[PDB]
Subunit: 288 residues, 4 copies
């Protein structure tokens, strides 16, 4: 059937590409040049936002729930009953539930579907998806997830965003702690390369030490794939998840504050892994 | 040639078993019944501590450098020139360098060779070894490491212990943060099983979420393989490493304090993963 | 002119008494018994909630903004233009700003006016008031604050609540840090009494070391004046203040988590200063 | 006749030795000797080469760290006479100071750690608080010579004074920084820092930091230089050593050392300790005033 994608960003562009190669796909983006470019590259069709309502399934991958609200309100007058809204934005659980209630007024079923895998996973089409919403709706949308591999239904609306936020909080902690430790080792003469060869074959290994630090930090490449400002935004959502019960969570709480320092020192558009540059700055040595 | 192993503990017993099946091996343990048991099971030879001096390579896997010192002093009169001392204890860099100096007076070459892989890695014989010491000595001992797989030379004496401490600090942080995050998700109705299925296929994954939490926490098994007290001891050594330059290290500094709380609440002989029981206690819910 | 006071708790009862001495005063309490008692003691007049709208100045001293909202909704149909609402509740800045906007629709000017000084200060009529609101409105209500001594205009609506929350957050940090410090000194043999004599005459002094620890901890008296659960609640409001700009605030964020630990270990009913009992438990020694 | 001597005429030492100079015949020495000469002209002390310091019955030192105390002790070692007292006002290390005490004992010299609190203003007023560590007999003998102090407390054996000083400064650090985080948040939402402090200083959250440092140095934008940020970090380092004794859970104090290290790395060790708040203003994009 016909699907539509809104938000052709670092993640949305490649994600919509997989959709375009499997289904008749309509695409829209605020900066429309991206939509025209996408049409030429993948066979999708660039359309005015209003036409997105023609789709059986509408996909969004925007910065925050705030922007998803914006596009939903713009489409509200045209939305048709029986339509599904798959939101791949790393959004806010509560605001998303309110959005789902609003969409139901038009017979549109909303599901939070944030993802993990980065731009490389998006390009490969192997993104892990954490779905939140009705089981019946989940079954209906699974076949349309052409850009994913592992798809997990984690609960009702909002549960997906909650799991994504916590996942990113763990990534943040793992990455920053590794930075602190490696900086200390490098300063006393240990090869960062050697330290990681050991760590990645030991109990302290994480996706951060295995697939981010060696490739982006040791190489000094620091490619831009996920804005530091967006990671801080996710950490903020994670704090919201922690506020539910407010059980003692000193480590994750501190994580939000340290990444905020990095954001203030390096800027929101720096890559998230560049947060380690702050440690290098204070340390007076590069993790190299 | 002859090798000898001192300290048949959770790690030492299986480690010495690999040596016993490759080389003529002598074994000794403070609680001697363990040595007699080892001899019966692996074909090693239980001997008085003094006879360990007959070995070309002496291995130790004790609690701390303090105990390595105790054993070394007891052996001083018997140590023979040309002997190698491979210390698999998760020891202190500085104290080990001092010990290496005094052993060098007897013609004994000390190498810090701490390991990672846990009791399961020790049983399989796939331990990762991080060696600190002279290049020539490293090449001489490699063939005797029958309980290892990945063996990395990370620097001079003490460097091995330094890397191990940092590796364990990363494990500690990764593990606790995961606990804080999963606790929050569980309290709002999300299955830890589901959350981990997502996380272990996402960017927040780590050895802690992949191989410790599902196996020990979700199952409620909490097997005893690595004492919480020893992990706190390792964290203490890591803080010594951070003290070298004293670059801002908020996350790792906090990690030592939270695990200390767990130790004081649960006892030093609880398994290190049981630290998460403190979070379950505060949260009033089990991580499942 | 006529005034009305809502909420005759440990703070409100004496506060309304000071008002009764100067102006015709109407009083209301969730439970009538207290209002009748007040009338019989001060000459105020106990009335049904509806009559409170007859006053020129309405005062509220309730548990939280939630209750202030409840009373506001009940009085809304009766509120008259040109009326002032002075809220002495330790409320939430944001929710209170929304309330002020709602009340403005009725020509009612809301001013947040939390107090410090406790029951002793309320009884003596020497409370310190931190006012948030328009300059002209502040000048208008100053002469009505019969229960106060120091009255300070700290900013726009919400600023009073914000200062109250931050103040208690600082009290929390100062008290806990002092505990960690004193615990270490006591463990190594230093007299808690002598340590405090020095500190209280030195740069590290605070109201906590000066008027709380020596009188309540060293003596083991631990009198109940401000519940630990209430301090945690105020710390929560403080985190909300922090959330406005989200500038790096590691110390204050950590403070909320450590007091939450105390609350979960000792219970909400324990006095706030008893939080140090948790440190005593871990340290294995009393701060005395 | 009996004389006293002071080594290290710094921010603290200069005025401290001034109080001694107007009270007893005092010999003074400073690495940068021009400082010693100026002191003689200003207080009536006698600037002399380091060797003459051993002529004193009581020798005072107020140097950066125990390290400098050590090298000055070695230089004087061959001249030290039995029966002399060494009053060390340096904010030093407990353990290193104990070894120094043993070493000095070889010459019949009695060491006492006597770190102080009160800042340069307290030093000038002669109202410093002193925390003594050492033998009761020695303490009683030195009390009458502490002309720059008001409150004097014997807290224990050698090293105990330095320990209490380190913890005191750790508390100051936490109090000052937390107030900064809180004030930064308040100013950002339209709250008057001046008025907020008036309330806080009349409430439970008050501390010496909010009462006598922030209003006078930050709100005014004056940021006078009286106590180097680098030295405060050094003190926090010593405080961490005190926490290492038992290693009971101490999250707040541990974190305090890390945040001030950040400030030191960003602003430099020679900035004033209170300038650490400039880092918060930097991140906040607003000044606390
Ligand atoms: N990058 C990564 O590695 C991962 C990111 N995510 C999450 O995916 C989401 C998007 O991230 P990413 O693709 O990197 O983001 P980018 O910044 O690359 O793209 C953001 C997209 O949102 C659009 N947008 C922004 N504001 C508006 C608006 N007001 N109205 C309409 N469209 C708007 C942009 O349009 P325009 O082109 O006009 O600017 C752009 O298409 C975020 O929630 C992020 O946290 C999840 C997993 C991984
Ligand atoms: N367990 C794990 O998962 C891992 C542990 N390590 C490190 O390995 C080292 C040992 O750990 P683990 O095997 O779990 O320890 P255990 O507590 O199981 O064993 C400790 C061993 O040291 C011996 N020992 C203790 N005190 C003395 C002494 N005074 N003189 C002589 N021998 C003594 C014990 O003898 P006895 O039988 O008489 O008590 C025992 O053989 C530690 O440094 C630990 O941090 C490293 C990686 C993994
Ligand atoms: N400032 C304050 O508010 C307080 C400081 N303290 C403690 O007092 C001690 C001194 O602080 P402060 O007075 O501010 O320090 P300053 O940096 O102002 O002065 C340090 C003094 O030590 C001397 N000095 C430095 N290195 C050497 C050396 N290698 N050999 C001989 N003399 C040396 C200096 O000599 P020169 O003139 O040649 O440079 C100077 O007289 C520190 O331990 C500090 O932590 C305690 C309470 C308060």
């Amino acid at each position: 059937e016909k699907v539509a994608f809104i938000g052709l960003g670092a993640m949305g562009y490649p994600m919509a590409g997989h959709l375009a190669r499997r289904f008749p796909t309509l695409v829209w983006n605020r900066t429309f040049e991206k939509a025209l470019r996408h049409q030429e590259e993948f066979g999708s069709e660039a359309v005015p936002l209003e036409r997105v309502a023609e789709a059986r399934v509408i996909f969004t991958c925007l910065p925050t729930t705030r922007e998803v609200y914006e596009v939903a309100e713009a489409l509200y007058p045209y939305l048709r009953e029986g339509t599904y809204w798959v939101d791949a934005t790393s959004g806010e659980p509560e605001a998303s539930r309110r959005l789902a209630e609003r969409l139901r007024e038009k017979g549109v079923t909303y599901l939070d579907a944030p993802v993990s895998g980065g731009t490389s996973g998006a390009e490969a089409g192997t993104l892990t998806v954490m779905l939140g919403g009705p089981e019946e709706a989940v079954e209906r949308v699974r076949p349309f997830l052409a850009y994913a591999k592992k798809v997990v239904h984690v609960g009702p609306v909002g549960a997906g965003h909650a799991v994504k936020a916590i996942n990113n909080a763990l990534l943040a902690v793992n990455l920053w702690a590794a930075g602190e430790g490696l900086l200390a080792l490098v300063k006393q003469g240990v090869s960062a390369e050697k330290a990681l060869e050991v760590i990645n074959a030991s109990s302290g290994r994480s996706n951060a030490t295995e697939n981010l630090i060696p490739q982006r930090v040791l190489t000094r490449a620091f490619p831009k794939t996920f804005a530091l400002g967006l990671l801080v935004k996710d950490l903020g959502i994670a704090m919201g998840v922690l506020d539910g019960e407010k059980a003692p969570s000193p480590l994750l709480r501190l994580a939000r504050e340290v990444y905020e320092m990095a954001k203030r020192e390096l800027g929101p558009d720096a890559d998230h892994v560049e947060a380690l540059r702050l440690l290098e700055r204070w340390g007076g040595v590069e993790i190299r």
